[PDB]
C-alpha cells in the first residue's frame, strides 16, 4: 500500500547544541508529505540514497535488516540483528538464505571473510534513518510511545560504522514503513532547551520557499521574491576534432640522445591526440610541474601551439627551469617567459647520460654579455671578454670560452647528475585547436538546453544555427562581457550561437500565513505560453 509520511524523519544533522535558533541545513532528508510504502505483517527494497524506516508494533516483530548489493556470497553485505541481549553488526561475505527471519541460524548459510564486526546494547514507533556516505554507515533513531502519526519528532545519532561497501538493496529481518531520502534544504527550529520542535521543507511548495527565504515560520501578507526558475540541461554533448593519430611523444621523451641546453631542441606537435597518461612511466620520482594548468586536467583540454623543448642539465639546475628564475641556465641558456603556460617534466637520466670517463656530449653556456629573451637560442662560440682589453682573438686572461661541458659521471652526487628536461609549451588561448586529449564526440543537439563541450570550452545553453561568419583563424565569438557567444563546430565547421537556458524570477503572493496557506506565483517577465511546465524534475 501507500501512505503519507507527513512531517516525519527529521534528524539532528550535527552534534552541536543550539537553542532559540532557526538553522538551515542541506542534507539527505525525507521530503515532507512523501509517499511511503507500507508493508504489513517481506521483499528486498532498494537503497536509493538512504532510508527512513518506521515500525509501529508492540511485540518486537522487527529485529534487523540486511543491507548489501547482491545479498549473496559473491559480494559483501551488511548485517544488523537485534538479539534480546545485544545488537550484532557484521559486514561480511554472506550467502544469505532466501527468506531470512528465536533461531537466528535461519538468516544466512555461510559467513565468509568478515572485514567488520561489532556488538552493542500502547504500541511503539521505532523510527530509523540509514545513510551511506564516504564509507560510513550512519544510523539515527528515535522511539516514541504511540498510518504514520502526524506530530514532529527528531532522531538522534546512534552510530557511524566504517563498513566500506556499496549498499543498493536491503531487507527487513522478521506494520513497517519505508521512505527514501533525497538531498534537500531544511529550516529547523531549535527550542530553548535545545530541541528541534519544527521544520520547513524549503522545496515542498512556494510558501515553504518563502518561509526559508525570510528565515521565519510565519509570513506576513505581501509579495516576495523567492528564487529564480532555471531550465535544467536535458543532456550533454562533446564536440572535439576528428583527429585520431597519437602524438609523437615517444620520439621526444624516448630519445637516445637529448640536446644541449645551450642548443636546446624544439619539436612541433600538431594534428594528433595527446594522451598525457603515457607519461608517468619515466624515471620514477620525476618532477611534473605545470603552470596555468594541472597535470591531471591535460587529458581533458585542447591546445593550439604545442612545442616540446628538450635538453639535459644537472639536477640542481632543474629549479632554474621556471618563470622568473635567475642563473647561468636561466640567463644564458634557456629562459621561460614570466607568463609561461605549460609544463616542465624533469627526470634523472644518470643511467642514460653519465659516462665513467666523463661525458662531453652536453654543454652549457656559462658566460654571456647580455641575458636571453624568452625562448631564444644562442649557439655562438665567440670569446667572452670580461676585461676592457681588445679581447678579439683567442682565450686567455679575462677572455673565456663561453661554453663549458657538464662531464656527467656515474660517481657524481645527485646534484651534478644528468637530468633530462622536457618543457611543453601550449596556448590555452582557445583559438583553433589541433592537439586534443582523448575524448569521444557525441552528436550535435541544436535548439535544446544541453551541457556542451567544444574543444574543452565547457558550458550550458542552447545552440542555434548562426548567421555570423568567422574568419579562418577564428574559433569563438565573444560579447561585451567577454563570454563566448558563438563557436565553430570542430567537426562540421558550422557556426553555432550559444544562448543561456531559459530562466527568470519567481515571486510568491501570500495573503499571510495567519490568514491562509494559499499562494499565487508570478513568473516575472514571462508569458504563460513560455512558463516552464516540465513534469519530471528537469526544470
Amino acid at each position, epitope marked *: 500500500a501507500y501512505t503519507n509520511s507527513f512531517t516525519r524523519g527529521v534528524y539532528y544533522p550535527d552534534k552541536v547544541f543550539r537553542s532559540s535558533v532557526l538553522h538551515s541545513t542541506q542534507d539527505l532528508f525525507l521530503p515532507f508529505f512523501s509517499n511511503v510504502t507500507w508493508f504489513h505483517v517481506n521483499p528486498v527494497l532498494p537503497f536509493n540514497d538512504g532510508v527512513y524506516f518506521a515500525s509501529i508494533e508492540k511485540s518486537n516483530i522487527i529485529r534487523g535488516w540486511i543491507f548489501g548489493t547482491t545479498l549473496d556470497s559473491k559480494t559483501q553485505s551488511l548485517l544488523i540483528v537485534n538479539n534480546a541481549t545485544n545488537v550484532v553488526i557484521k559486514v561480511c561475505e554472506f550467502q544469505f538464505c532466501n527468506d531470512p527471519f528465536e533461531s537466528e541460524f535461519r538468516v544466512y548459510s555461510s559467513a565468509n571473510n568478515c572485514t567488520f564486526e561489532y556488538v552493542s546494547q500502547f504500541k511503539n514507533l521505532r523510527e530509523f534513518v540509514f545513510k551511506n556516505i564516504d564509507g560510513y554507515f550512519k544510523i539515527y533513531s528515535k522511539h516514541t510511545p504511540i498510518d504514520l502519526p502526524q506530530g514532529f519528532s527528531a532522531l538522534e545519532p546512534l552510530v557511524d560504522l566504517p563498513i566500506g561497501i556499496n549498499i543498493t538493496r536491503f531487507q527487513t529481518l522478521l506494520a513497517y514503513y519505508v521512505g527514501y531520502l533525497q538531498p534537500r534544504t531544511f529550516l529547523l527550529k531549535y527550542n530553548e532547551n535545545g530541541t528541534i520542535t519544527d521544520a520547513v521543507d524549503c522545496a515542498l511548495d512556494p510558501l515553504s520557499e518563502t518561509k526559508c527565504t525570510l528565515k521565519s515560520f510565519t509570513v506576513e501578507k505581501g509579495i516576495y521574491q523567492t528564487s529564480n526558475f532555471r531550465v535544467q540541461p536535458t543532456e550533454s554533448i562533446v564536440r572535439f576534432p576528428n583527429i585520431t593519430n597519437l602524438c609523437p611523444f615517444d620520439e621526444v621523451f624516448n630519445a637516445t640522445r637529448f640536446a644541449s641546453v645551450y642548443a636546446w631542441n624544439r619539436k612541433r606537435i600538431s594534428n594528433c591526440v595527446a594522451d598525457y597518461s603515457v607519461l608517468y612511466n619515466l624515471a620514477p620520482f620525476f618532477t611534473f610541474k605545470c603552470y596555468g594548468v594541472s597535470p591531471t586536467k591535460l587529458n581533458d583540454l585542447c591546445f593550439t601551439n604545442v612545442y616540446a623543448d628538450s635538453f639535459v642539465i644537472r639536477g640542481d639546475e632543474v629549479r632554474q627551469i621556471a618563470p622568473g628564475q635567475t642563473g647561468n641556465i636561466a640567463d644564458y641558456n634557456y629562459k621561460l617567459p614570466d607568463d609561461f603556460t605549460g609544463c616542465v617534466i624533469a627526470w634523472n637520466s644518470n643511467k642514460l647520460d*653519465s659516462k665513467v670517463s666523463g661525458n662531453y656530449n652536453y654543454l652549457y653556456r656559462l658566460f654571456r654579455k647580455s641575458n636571453l629573451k624568452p625562448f631564444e637560442r644562442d649557439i655562438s662560440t665567440e670569446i667572452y671578454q670580461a676585461g676592457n682589453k681588445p679581447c678579439n682573438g683567442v682565450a686567455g686572461f679575462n677572455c673565456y670560452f663561453p661554453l663549458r661541458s657538464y662531464s656527467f659521471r656515474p660517481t657524481y652526487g645527485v646534484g651534478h647528475q644528468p637530468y633530462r628536461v622536457v618543457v611543453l609549451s601550449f596556448e590555452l588561448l582557445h583559438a583553433p585547436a589541433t592537439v586534443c586529449g582523448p575524448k569521444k564526440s557525441t552528436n550535435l543537439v541544436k535548439n535544446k538546453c544541453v551541457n556542451f563541450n567544444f574543444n574543452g570550452l565547457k558550458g550550458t545553453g542552447v545552440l542555434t544555427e548562426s548567421n555570423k561568419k568567422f574568419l579562418p583563424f577564428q574559433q569563438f565569438g565573444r560579447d561585451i562581457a567577454d563570454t563566448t557567444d558563438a563557436v565553430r563546430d570542430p567537426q562540421t565547421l558550422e557556426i553555432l550561437d550559444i544562448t543561456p537556458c531559459s530562466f527568470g524570477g519567481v515571486s510568491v503572493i501570500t495573503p499571510g500565513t495567519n490568514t491562509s496557506n494559499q499562494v499565487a506565483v508570478l513568473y516575472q517577465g514571462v508569458n504563460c505560453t513560455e512558463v516552464p511546465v516540465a513534469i519530471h524534475a528537469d526544470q
Partner: antibody
Amino acid sequence: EVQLVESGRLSCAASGFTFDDYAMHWVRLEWVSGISWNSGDIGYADSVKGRFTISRDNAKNSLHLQALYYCAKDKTYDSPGYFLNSFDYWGQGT
Amino acid sequence: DIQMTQSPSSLSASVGDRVTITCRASQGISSYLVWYQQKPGKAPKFLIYAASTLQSGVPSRFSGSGSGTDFTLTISSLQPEDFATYYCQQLYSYPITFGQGTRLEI
C-alpha cells in the same frame, strides 16, 4: 629491421635504424675499435694504433675503416662507460 | 689493460641441466659488462645488460650477476637453444676486451 652488412678498407652499410643516433664498433672475439655518433670518441685497440682508422659517414649510414670482422651497433650513442652500453645488433662477417 | 678470463675453459650438460658460467678480469669494471652468445656458425646475440634488466624478448633463464670481475651466468632449464659459446664482455674502459669462449657441449 636492423641490417648490418659488412660491405667490403671496410665499409659497413647500415639499414633499418637511425645510424646517426648510435655508436658503431668493429670486432674481429678481439674487439677492434669503436666510434661515437658524432665521431667525438674514437677508441682503438692495443694492436692497431697507426694501422687501422675508424670513421663514419652519417649521411649515407656507413661505418668505414681503413678472423672475420663484424659490424656491431652500440645500444647507445657514445664510448664505453654507460649503464646501457652494449652491442645489441651484429652483422654477418667478413 | 684488462683480461677477460672465462673460467670454465668449457662446460657441458644436457636438457634440463642448469649450468653456471664465470669469467675474471684485471681491474674492477663494476656492472659495465654484458654476456653475449655465439651459436655454432651464427653471429653473437644479446642476452642481458648489467645483469638485471634482461633484454626484451629474451628467455629470462639466461641471467647472472656480480660486480668487479665476479660474474656468474645462470640458467634454469638449459635446453637445445641454450648450447653455445657464451662470452663475457667488459665495457668499463677502452680498449674493450672480450673473453675466449666457454664453448658448451652436447
